[PDB]
Write a protein that binds this ligand. Structure first.
Ligand SMILES: CC(C)(C)OC(=O)N1CCN(c2cc(-c3ccccc3O)nnc2N)CC1
Length: 110
């Protein structure tokens, strides 16, 4: 695997694997967004749906030319979560924390 592919897998795994101070894996809610059949209202609040399974499949299909492209999908996903849920909710706070982890991970790989 190229250094580019190694950095992509590392960024993805940092987000996926992060746990909080009590061991809770924050990424669990962001793996699979329910379909529009199951969750119509989300697809009207949210222009471009995104979840980690989609990011993972783009990564296995090498569709990421650089790291910036992967971060954009992650930031899109976390912005989506912070649009659909209110700031006081757990999912909003989990999105904010994983967003910070994402950027700190990209920075550490600079
Ligand atoms: C019972 C039924 C009505 C089907 O609802 C559910 O099963 N839900 C579970 C998922 N849930 C949410 C997912 C995301 C989310 C997921 C992946 C990526 C980004 C995201 O924002 N965000 N906010 C939510 N609150 C919506 C409600």
């Amino acid at each position: 695997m190229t250094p580019m592919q190694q950095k992509l897998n590392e960024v993805y795994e940092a987000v996926k694997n992060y746990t909080d101070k009590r061991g809770r894996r924050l990424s669990a809610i962001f793996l699979r967004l329910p379909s529009r059949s199951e969750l119509p209202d989300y697809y009207l609040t949210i222009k471009k749906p995104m979840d980690m399974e989609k990011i993972r499949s783009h990564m296995m299909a090498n569709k990421y030319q650089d790291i910036d492209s992967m971060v954009e999908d992650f930031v899109m996903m976390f912005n989506n979560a912070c649009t659909y849920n209110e700031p006081e909710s757990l999912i909003y706070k989990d999105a904010l924390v994983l967003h910070k982890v994402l950027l700190e991970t990209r920075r550490d790989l600079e």
